[PDB]
C-alpha cells in the first residue's frame with residue numbers, strides 16, 4: 107500500500123532527525139503515524155517536565171553571555187526602522203525583499219544600520235575599542251527554501267577602533283563557533299551592501315557574512331575609524347546543531363516547538 | 371539668564387533620576403550641560419567596564435528564569451502575524467492602532483492570539499495544567515505619552531485546565547511582582563477584547579491587565595477549558611524600577627542606553 111504525497115508530508119512533519127524509520131517500508135500509514143505521534147508526544151512531555159526553555163531563546167541567552175563576557179555591550183535597537191535606511195545602505199532600487207510598514211517605515215532586514223549608529227554615538231563617550239552586539243528579529247521576503255525564513259533572528263557583533271583586523275575578526279568567529287561546537291571554513295564572497303565578505307560556511311550552508319572595514323559606505327553613516335563585524339542567523343545555527351532538514355523547525359512558529367511538531 | 375525651551379529640553383535629555391540639580395537656578399546653560407555630560411559619560415563608561423547587559427534584555431532573562439522555574443513553557447512565536455487575527459480577537463472596525471504589513475499581515479499588538487493557539491495545540495499532548503509564557507515585541511500606534519511606546523515588549527503568561535482561578539492568578543502576579551520588588555494594587559477594569567480585567571496598578575500606572583476565563587471569545591479560538599492569563603509591559607516595569615520620567619528611557623532606541631542619553 108503506497109503512501110500519497112499528503113501522507114508522506116504528514117509523516118515528515120512528525121519525523122525527527124534522531125529517528126530511523128523507513129516511511130515506504132510497506133507498513134501502513136496508520137501505524138507509522140501512530141508510532142511517530144507517540145514518540146513526539148513523549149518528546150514534548152519530557153521538554154515540559156524537564157527542559158522548558160525555547161531553543162531560540164536559550165541560544166540567544168548563551169550567545170549574549172559569550173559576548174558580554176568578552177567585553178561587548180549588549181544592544182537592543184528598533185525592529186521597526188525608517189525606510190530611508192534602506193537606500194542609504196546602498197540597497198538600490200534585496201530591495202524587493204523589504205517588508206514595508208505604513209509609508210515611511212519598514213521591518214529591518216539586518217541589524218547593521220542600527221549598530222552603525224551606535225558605534226558612531228558611543229565613540230564619543232567610550233574608550234577605544236568600541237565593541238557592541240545585538241541579537242534579534244530581522245525580516246526579508248524570500249522564496250520558499252530549506253535555509254531561508256521570512257522572519258529570522260540575527261546576531262551581529264562588531265568593533266570599531268583598534269584591533270579591527272582580519273585576523274582578529276577570524277579569531278572572534280573561531281572562538282564563537284568553537285564555543286557552540288560548530289565546525290566551519292571561511293570562503294570569500296561579495297555582496298551589494300558591503301563589498302567583499304568573509305563568508306563562514308558549514309558545508310554548503312552560509313552561517314555568516316563578515317566584513318573588514320573601512321568601506322565607502324562608512325561616510326554616509328558617519329563612521330570614520332577601522333571596524334570589523336559579522337552577522338549570523340540563529341536559526342541556521344540551530345539547524346546545524348540539531349540536524350534539522352528544514353530551517354522551519356528552528357523558526358518562531360506555532361507549528362514546531364523546539365523542532366517537535368505542535369500538530370499532535 | 372533664562373533657559374530656552376530647546377536648552378531645557380537638552381538638559382532634560384541628559385538628566386537622570388538620581389541627580390538633584392536645579393536647571394533654572396541661574397547657572398548658565400553651558401555649565402549645566404557640561405556637568406550633566408560629564409556625569410552621563412562616567413555612567414556609560416562604568417556600564418561598559420562592568421555592567422554590559424541591556425536593561426530590556428536582562429529583564430527578559432530574569433522574567434524567563436522566574437516562569438521556567440515555576441513550570442511554564444517558554445514560547446517564541448511570530449511577531450509578524452495574519453491580519454485576520456485582529457477581527458477574530460473582537461477588535462472591531464484599538465483597531466486603528468494596528469501597524470499593517472503588506473495586505474494580509476500586521477505586527478502583533480499583543481501576544482494573546484499566538485498563546486491561545488499554543489494552549490489549544492499543547493492540550494492535546496501535555497498533562498493538565500498547561501502553563502506557558504512569552505516575552506517579546508508588540509506594536510501599537512499611540513498618541514505621544516509618557517507611558518506609551520509604539521514598539522514595546524510584552525510578557526504574557528497563562529494557564530489552562532486546573533488551577534485557573536482568580537486566587538491563583540492573583541497569587542502568581544503577587545509572587546512575580548514581589549520577585550521584582552514592585553508594589554502594586556489590583557483594580558477592576560474592562561476592555562473590548564476580554565471583558566472584565568483585573569488591572570495591576572503601581573500608583574496610577576497600569577502594569578498589567580489580567581483575565582480569568584472562560585470568556586465568549588474562547589469558542590472562536592478553540593479554547594474549551596478554564597484559563598487565566600496576564601500581560602505586562604516590560605518598559606513600564608523598567609520605568610518603575612528606575613524612576614524614569616518618560617518610558618522612552620526604557621525603550622528600544624538608538625537615543626538611550628540603559629536610560630543614559632547616547633547623544634553625548
Ligand SMILES: Nc1ncnc2c1ncn2[C@@H]1O[C@H](COP(=O)(O)OP(=O)(O)OP(=O)(O)O)[C@@H](O)[C@H]1O
Nearest residue numbers: 246248253254255258312313314315337338339342
Ligand atoms: N532569510 C533568512 N533566513 C534565515 N537566516 C538568514 C536569512 N537571511 C540571512 N540569514 C542569516 O543572516 C546572515 C547574514 O545575512 P546576509 O545578508 O549575509 O545573508 P545572505 O548573504 O543574504 O544569505 P543567503 O545568501 O543565504 O540568502 C546569513 O549568513 C544567514 O546566517
Ligand SMILES: Nc1ncnc2c1ncn2[C@@H]1O[C@H](COP(=O)(O)OP(=O)(O)OP(=O)(O)O)[C@@H](O)[C@H]1O
Nearest residue numbers: 510512517518519522576577578579601602603606
Ligand atoms: N503602547 C504601549 N507601550 C508600552 N506598554 C504598553 C503599551 N500598551 C500596552 N502596554 C503594556 O501591556 C500591558 C497589556 O496590554 P493592555 O492591552 O492591557 O494595555 P492597555 O490597557 O491598552 O494599556 P493603556 O490603557 O495604558 O493603554 C499593559 O498593562 C501595559 O503594561
Ligand SMILES: [N-]=[N+]=Nc1ccccc1COC(=O)NCCCC[C@H](N)C(=O)O
Nearest residue numbers: 195218219222264317323324335336337
Ligand atoms: N548598513 N549598515 N551598516 C553599516 C554601514 C556603514 C558602516 C558601518 C555599518 C555598521 O557596521 C557594523 O558595525 N555592523 C556590522 C557590519 C557588517 C555586518 C555583516 N556584514 C552582516 O551583513 O551581518
Ligand SMILES: [N-]=[N+]=Nc1ccccc1COC(=O)NCCCC[C@H](N)C(=O)O
Nearest residue numbers: 459482483486528581587588599600601
Ligand atoms: N485574542 N486572544 N487570546 C485569546 C482569545 C481567546 C481565548 C484565549 C486567548 C488567549 O488566552 C491566553 O492564554 N493569553 C492571555 C489572555 C489574556 C491576556 C491578557 N489579558 C493581556 O491583554 O495581555
Ligand SMILES: [K+]
Nearest residue numbers: 123124125126
Ligand atoms: K534519521
Ligand SMILES: [K+]
Nearest residue numbers: 255256257357
Ligand atoms: K517566516
Ligand SMILES: [K+]
Nearest residue numbers: 387388389390
Ligand atoms: K531627581
Ligand SMILES: [K+]
Nearest residue numbers: 519520521621
Ligand atoms: K516606539
Ligand SMILES: [Mg+2]
Nearest residue numbers: 200246248254
Ligand atoms: Mg539572501
Ligand SMILES: [Mg+2]
Nearest residue numbers: 295305312315
Ligand atoms: Mg549569501
Ligand SMILES: [Mg+2]
Nearest residue numbers: 297312314315
Ligand atoms: Mg551573506
Ligand SMILES: [Mg+2]
Nearest residue numbers: 464510512518
Ligand atoms: Mg492602550
Ligand SMILES: [Mg+2]
Nearest residue numbers: 559569576579
Ligand atoms: Mg488600560
Ligand SMILES: [Mg+2]
Nearest residue numbers: 561576578579
Ligand atoms: Mg489593560
